[PDB]
Paper text:
Here, we report 11 lineages of V2 apex–neutralizing antibodies from simian-[name] virus (SHIV)-infected rhesus macaques and determine cryo-EM structures for 9. Envelope complex structures revealed eight different antibody classes (one multi-donor) and the complete repertoire of all five possible recognition topologies, recapitulating canonical human modes of apex insertion and C-strand hydrogen bonding. On the negative side, to penetrate the apical glycan shield of [name] and bind underlying conserved positively charged residues, broadly neutralizing V2 apex antibodies must contain heavy chain third complementarity-determining regions (HCDR3s) that are exceptionally long, anionic, and often tyrosine sulfated.
A single Fab of all three rhesus antibodies bound asymmetrically to the trimer C3 axis with an extended HCDR3 that penetrated between the N160 glycans of two adjacent protomers. However, unlike VRC26.25, which inserted two sulfated Tyr residues, the rhesus lineages utilized either one (V031-a.01 and 6561-a.01) or none (40591-a.01). This Tyr residue was somatically mutated to Phe (Y100eFHCDR3) in 40591-a*01, the only VRC26-like antibody that did not exhibit tyrosine sulfation. The center of the VRC26.25 Fab was positioned ∼10-Å further from the [name] surface due to its exceptionally long HCDR3 that was 10 to 12 residues longer than each of the rhesus lineage HCDR3s.
Residue numbers in the entry:
A (entry chain D): 1 to 52, 52A, 53 to 82, 82A, 82B, 82C, 83 to 100, 100A, ...
B (entry chain E): 1 to 107
C (entry chain H): 31 to 58, 63 to 137, 150 to 309, 312 to 321, 321A, 322 to 354, 358 to 395, 412 to 458, ...
D (entry chain C), E (entry chain G): 31 to 58, 63 to 138, 150 to 309, 312 to 321, 321A, 322 to 354, 358 to 395, 412 to 458, ...
F (entry chain F): 515 to 543, 563 to 663
G (entry chain B), H (entry chain A): 519 to 543, 563 to 663
Write the structure that this text describes.
Amino acid sequence: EVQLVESGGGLVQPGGSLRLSCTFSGRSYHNYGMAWVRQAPGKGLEWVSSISSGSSYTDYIGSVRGRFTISRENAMNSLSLHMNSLRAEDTGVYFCASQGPDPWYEDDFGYHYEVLSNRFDVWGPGVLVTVS
Amino acid sequence: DIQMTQSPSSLSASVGDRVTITCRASQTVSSNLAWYQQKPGKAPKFLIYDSSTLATGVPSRFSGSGSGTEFTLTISSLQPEDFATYYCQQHYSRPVTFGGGTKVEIK
Amino acid sequence: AENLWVTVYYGVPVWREADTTLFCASDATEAHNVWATHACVPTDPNPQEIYLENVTENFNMWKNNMVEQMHTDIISLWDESLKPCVKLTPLCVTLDCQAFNSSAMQEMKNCSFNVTTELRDKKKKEYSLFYKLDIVQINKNGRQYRLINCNTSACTQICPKVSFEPIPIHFCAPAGFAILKCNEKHFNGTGPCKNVSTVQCTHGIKPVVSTQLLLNGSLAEEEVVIRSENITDNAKTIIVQLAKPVKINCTRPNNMTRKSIRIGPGQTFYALGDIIGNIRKPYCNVSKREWNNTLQQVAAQLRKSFNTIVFEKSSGGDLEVTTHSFNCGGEFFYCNTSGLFNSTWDTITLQCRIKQIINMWQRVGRCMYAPPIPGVIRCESNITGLLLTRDGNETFRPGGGDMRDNWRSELYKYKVVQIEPLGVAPTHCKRR
Amino acid sequence: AENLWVTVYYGVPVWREADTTLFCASDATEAHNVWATHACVPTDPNPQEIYLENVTENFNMWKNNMVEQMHTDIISLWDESLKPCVKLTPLCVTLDCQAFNSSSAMQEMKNCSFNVTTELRDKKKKEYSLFYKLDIVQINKNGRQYRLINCNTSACTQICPKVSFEPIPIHFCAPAGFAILKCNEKHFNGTGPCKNVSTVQCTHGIKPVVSTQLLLNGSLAEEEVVIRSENITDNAKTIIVQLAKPVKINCTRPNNMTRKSIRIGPGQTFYALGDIIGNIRKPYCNVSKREWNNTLQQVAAQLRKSFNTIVFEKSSGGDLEVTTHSFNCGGEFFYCNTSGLFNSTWDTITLQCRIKQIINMWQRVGRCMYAPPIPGVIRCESNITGLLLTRDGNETFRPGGGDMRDNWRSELYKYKVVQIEPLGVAPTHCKRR
Amino acid sequence: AENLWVTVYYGVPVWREADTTLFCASDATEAHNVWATHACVPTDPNPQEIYLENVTENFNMWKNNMVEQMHTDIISLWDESLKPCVKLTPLCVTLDCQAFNSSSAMQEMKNCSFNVTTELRDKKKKEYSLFYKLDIVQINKNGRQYRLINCNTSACTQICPKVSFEPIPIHFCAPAGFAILKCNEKHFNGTGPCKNVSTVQCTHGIKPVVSTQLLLNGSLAEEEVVIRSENITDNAKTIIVQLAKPVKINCTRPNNMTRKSIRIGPGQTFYALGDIIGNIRKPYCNVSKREWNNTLQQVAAQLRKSFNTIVFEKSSGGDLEVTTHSFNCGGEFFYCNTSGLFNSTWDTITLQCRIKQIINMWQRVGRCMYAPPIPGVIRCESNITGLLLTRDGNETFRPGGGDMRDNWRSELYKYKVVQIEPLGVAPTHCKRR
Amino acid sequence: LGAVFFGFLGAAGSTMGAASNTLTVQARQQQLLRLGVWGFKQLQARVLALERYLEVQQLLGIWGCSGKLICCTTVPWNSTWSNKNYTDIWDNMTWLQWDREIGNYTDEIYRLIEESQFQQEINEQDLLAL
Amino acid sequence: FFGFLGAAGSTMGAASNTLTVQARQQQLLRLGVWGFKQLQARVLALERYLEVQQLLGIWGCSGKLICCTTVPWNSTWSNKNYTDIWDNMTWLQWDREIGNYTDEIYRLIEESQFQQEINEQDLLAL
Amino acid sequence: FFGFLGAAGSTMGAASNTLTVQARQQQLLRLGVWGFKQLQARVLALERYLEVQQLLGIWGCSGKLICCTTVPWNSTWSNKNYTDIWDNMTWLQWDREIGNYTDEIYRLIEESQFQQEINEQDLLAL
Ligand SMILES: *[C@@H]1O[C@H](CO)[C@@H](O[C@@H]2O[C@H](CO)[C@@H](O[C@@H]3O[C@H](CO[C@H]4O[C@H](CO)[C@@H](O)[C@H](O)[C@@H]4O)[C@@H](O)[C@H](O[C@H]4O[C@H](CO)[C@@H](O)[C@H](O)[C@@H]4O)[C@@H]3O)[C@H](O)[C@H]2NC(C)=O)[C@H](O)[C@H]1NC(C)=O
Ligand SMILES: *[C@@H]1O[C@H](CO)[C@@H](O[C@@H]2O[C@H](CO)[C@@H](O)[C@H](O)[C@H]2NC(C)=O)[C@H](O)[C@H]1NC(C)=O
Ligand SMILES: *[C@@H]1O[C@H](CO)[C@@H](O)[C@H](O)[C@H]1NC(C)=O
Ligand SMILES: *[C@@H]1O[C@H](CO)[C@@H](O)[C@H](O)[C@H]1NC(C)=O
């Protein structure tokens, strides 16, 4: 089974650089894309950003373009959201979620691909982020 | 941009009842739609993808109408572990966005 | 008796027509450029010191084999220098493409292809911009393109660690030889020169490559000059040379960015990135009046041989040859010239296209992929000749012929000759 | 004495054995070939064979430096010439194969079909072509999915069809200051003195012919057959024969085969056997008796002079390149049987035999070559001039060979490369004034 | 009257300092070794030396052009030697490794199963091979799913086992018209005037070993271990120590490694460590105490001559290469601790060692290699003949790495190349008639 | 360096007499790319350049005039080659014309000197043998 | 080999007797960088050797180890006397001292022999 | 030369008859094996010519094909006289018989001709 944990969230003044971190407690992290999903209290889930397993296809939602930074280090099985320039409307629970493991299309030799297959297979327990 | 919405906002049902939740998209998506369950006090869980394929850990009381664009989620029988909030998403193209969500309640 | 005996002199002025290899010399940061001064012998830029009188010699630039051995040697250098950087064999994959599209112009395609990452186990789909001239169709439905050259050769990128910017090249004969320099004003190539000198090495020869026009080239001292092996027959190109040059300005007003792709292990392929700033087609400037005037000049020399004159667009061929192709700023061009040679006897625009995949030479077995240069491009150069041809009411059209005719515009004055330092004649003197 | 004084004479006729770098020379002449015969040096105008009368000199073909420095140099021509040509590495794939049939039964082949990459790197294509059984192997005993022979040691070059490799006369010229002496004895057996000797600037025509168990298109002995060896007594030495009467031979591949072209990769094209025009018939060599009957008896008569009755026998064993007569005809390599040729003890004899596309051609087993098949009917007429025999050690003889450089010894034995020593010092009545 | 007139002498003994290339000569299975015929005249002698008297000359080991000339030649050939060897690109694949966990549980070793392209360009095969932990890096915190340490920057050639690694002696010769002067002082300085000088046509035999922190098999001082640096007052500059008494070093791998051949592709092979025979133990070096102690005491005794309290300190830290004595034991590249030696101030002492197959071995990062394993037990005796030392500026001296050419400066400090200028003009009473 | 010496010539087109004094002009008071044309073609040119200079000096070694720039000889003129008088050739003609003329017989003139110098040398040696 | 460089440190008076041909004077593979460099250096050797050979021939000292000329010495170059130069000083220092003025010496040798040779031709013209 | 050996078996004195001289000393590709082979061989040929000439230019015999020297013969080298040789023997076996001594003879000519030069210039210095 795949399990995850978040850490670093808390309360910080507006305009801060409150970073977030997710850890992957499982095997085969080399071929998992990952994403962050926001949830303001009472409202629906909102997609924040995504980074492929190879870290070459980072993508974001337009509501945070240019502000946020998503990074990962395969050598230590972790995902780091280096969020910068927060504002109060960013308040809401943050979940780190991992896209399904990369497709396997054995045709000629081994073949692992690098889609951002936007199915959030597993979600970590979540960590609160509040700005006031 | 793929606007997504669900209707009705919430439904009423009881254990043993057949349940149905509807999700609609402004733009067309062939079969790339998925669902989640969010028990309050816990992060979401993965239910259905490709609009018809079940998740690895889902007890198979669920099924998705994976045709056209009137995507809908149906439950053969309602049990208390299924008595929680629900979400639908398109995973055809980015940016991803989840509908307003829907909730179930006692009948 | 007349009392005469053989007398031997060492150092006599006697010379013989000869053919021999020559060695490069050039003017004075590692790996610099393809015309390497570190490959040439710098030698000396100012030989000078010569004068000659009362000599007459017969030149034939149309059979001056100095150009031919030089012709092959220049290709050998260019072929040799492409050894160390990558072969684009992995780039032969089916390309899925979309319209360039807004963020709306054309002549480019948003082509994406599959490429292997650091490990063979895993792959990634990259995206890039390619010109339509670099691509051909496979399925008529409008997708699944193919690269132009993959059915003929695995192309080499022009890796920018060594550039193509041409420095002047001095050609030197080896010890025991000299180069006779015909020095008249109106010396049209073949026949007996009457004002001649010599020199150890030629002046700065620009290793330019172009078609239908000569750029940064030699100039006749005064009055335009024309050269042809024959005028009655129309098989071979006629070379025109301008004493009064006309400036030509080129530009690519687009801040095109460069995108690096890890195509192979340790090999970096270069492809076009996003376009920054405004959008414009590449075009060239030549000024009206300033340009139109020179055609009034050349017409005189044509009709000095032919008992009205008209100039018309390119006779025909592939886009390789129906165009003024040249290099400007490190990115190759292929332009029209139909807006100039359209006359009978404010800047006038020449809008045209760029290519990344080039062959230049008639030899198709070698390919070169020139990566884009970051930022806008512009350059100014002197036009000093044409490569026209006769149609035979008699019109002309700008031909290109085979490449080597460009060189003869720079080497017509020079003839390599061997020195026979020994001469013997009878004299009344006698050995003691 | 008269207190005689040392004196220097510049230009004395004296010489010394030496090792030196020879270079090519050829007649003028056309076409592009594997040999770098691009004008080498022009052949000799009226070649000057100057006779060195009255002077005794010695030759030793088995220690001559010419063959060693040349066989190690001839390999470079093929390597240097085949460096640009396509390597068939991508062609190493599993081959679907079934027994060949066509309108008239012909053994040694299978109409194999296989997967290869198309012009693009990532798009396979179904292609098929005919293959000789000698150059194909089965992956497993199940009886399907065959494979090429060369893929488990080295994928190897295809010879570019645009370059020919038919032998042409090559003159080996010693550099200025050296000379090449020639032995002209009638009965010279590879070693010892030569009573009649001359010198030349370059050797006469030597043809880079490659063959085994039989010389082809060699230099004919003017009269009387001769046998040459390092030492007759031991069986470890090749027994080179040089015929006097050139028994003729004709060989052919009667089938009119078609050259089928297949695209392998970017700028790479591969040629393989295609459809056959005509009817089935085995390739063979064509020699006449009487002519061969005479020489085999004649050579044996000269052989037993060193053994005070003679026997000939079929090859002993080993690989095909040693057990079989290898040679070239029209662009395809024939390895041919010769069993009936040596069928004697003391009209024509037909030698049916086969082709192989893939060859090694040297003991440089790492190197390998694939010869593209030649379209149309192929026919050669050739001369035999020598036999590469071996002895077991009444006597029995077999065609041997094994080594390639013995083919040069059969022509280079007449030459020695020698350095001119123009300075000599001797006493004289002079005293310098 | 004086009546003096110009007189020209051809061949007066005067020389001028000049820079020119020296062609290589060396002592005496095709392609044999690194120092084969590819670059040097084989098996030439060590000829006579010309003695000189009353001559003085000012040499400079740091401005000597021979060192800078030689460094690019070593790289050029070492690149040439590996031109034909297989490119190891097809080995770049995720490895399903796991703990070695095999008895006859070693540390620093792994067992890896990985997919491979076999002789044919279709079908995989689950080949396997051992790997040293230094040549392999984990991709996940889990530890599994390893990767080679070099594939991300540049995949690099295997070293073909058919060419030997041994550094046979090399001699450098000057062209005609140039001479190689040689200094002979018992306590030469590396700079300044030599009061005792000679000259020779070809240098003495250099054994081009590659090492760091310890020169092996190199030259030796006659007596009084010597110190050589650009400026001893400066610190960032390297200090080269050359011993007089050699101290013996024995280095070994007690294990009996079997060689496994992996058919990595069509005509390609990738050698790797196989199953291990016999008792299992880590490698190490042997250097005798009371001899290193005498050696280290000595150098300290002569170090203090330029510092009016000396300390020897552990390596500088960082990358395992520059921090570690890195030499080649006749076919495998060893990395040895050295921290047990350079700990001192003013029986046997053992150093444990680690093997790295994927190596760069140049400060120039534009090259890489894979040294195949040497099957069977391996042991190599050697002499330590010099040290590399670095200073921070009561001094602490670390074992030095730095530029590679510093090794060559230990052997070539004696030599200078001088251009001959034989023409000489001077006045004389004589007069031409 | 096998210098061309007179090389680019002085008053080449003048009459022959200029060569007697125009020779007063003075005479002398890198790694190169290994692989390309400028490595091998340049090397080939220098080798053949030396071949030419030595060939000249060897011939001067059989004219017997080595170490000089001018020399007279013992061989009288032969009318079978030409019949020009002194003013007709030395005063009136340039060197280039003369070489174009006697080229048909220049080799024989060289041959005549070759045997003549050898004949003179052995005669001198015969005198020294006494 | 007897005196290849051995006479360097001797006084020029004694060193004048120890000239002994100071200048003095197997296939190697084709493709290596060493093959070209090894061949290149030997070609440069011929150029160096013939630079001296050509100069001596032009200076009229062909085929001689020692030769006297017709031009006087000039004290502006050096004021050393016979006993200072031959009996005391060594060859190396003479090159060091006169290095500034060697061009003047070479010019005088060049012109002195040339004007003499044409004068000799005047004698041959008789 | 190839015809230069034409005297061959005729006894010693025949070297002066049928006069000629030995071998004196088409563009082709650069890296072709024959291009290197001819080019390397020609540099070898050049070295095999100059080293002979400079000896003639150091023994005081350059230019001339036959010259006589100043040193006398030594009986240890050979006891045979002029009459026993020139009408009976050829150069070939004579060279193969004397090769043990040729190094000594070479240096004796060099020093014995060099002493003439210093003798000449010493004489001219008077
Ligand atoms: C006819 O001759 C003219 C002579 O002027 C040529 O035009 C010039 O060509 C040079 C050489 O290519 C051009 O130089 C280019 O300039 C760029 C930088 O521009 C600044 O610096 C240059 C001086 O270096 C200034 O002249 C200029 O005003 C700017 O201040 C570079 O983009 C070019 O490449 C350089 O950088 C890249 C990246 O580092 C390297 O890869 C290259 O090797 C190189 O170092 C280049 O240097 C110059 O701009 C041209 N001048 C004009 C006025 O046009 C014509 O090209 C020639 N015609 C033909 C047909 O060949
Ligand atoms: C080239 O030819 C011309 C014409 O014959 C020569 O003209 C010289 O002119 C001057 C003028 O003062 C006269 O004094 C000379 O007598 C003329 N020379 C002769 C030879 O007649 C001119 O000298 C010639 N130039 C050369 C270099 O030979
Ligand atoms: C060889 O001769 C024998 C004689 O008995 C005969 O049986 C056999 O068929 C012959 N073989 C050939 C190939 O001629
Ligand atoms: C050497 O061994 C010591 C033992 O304490 C250890 O600390 C050190 O890391 C080892 N390696 C090096 C390079 O010193």
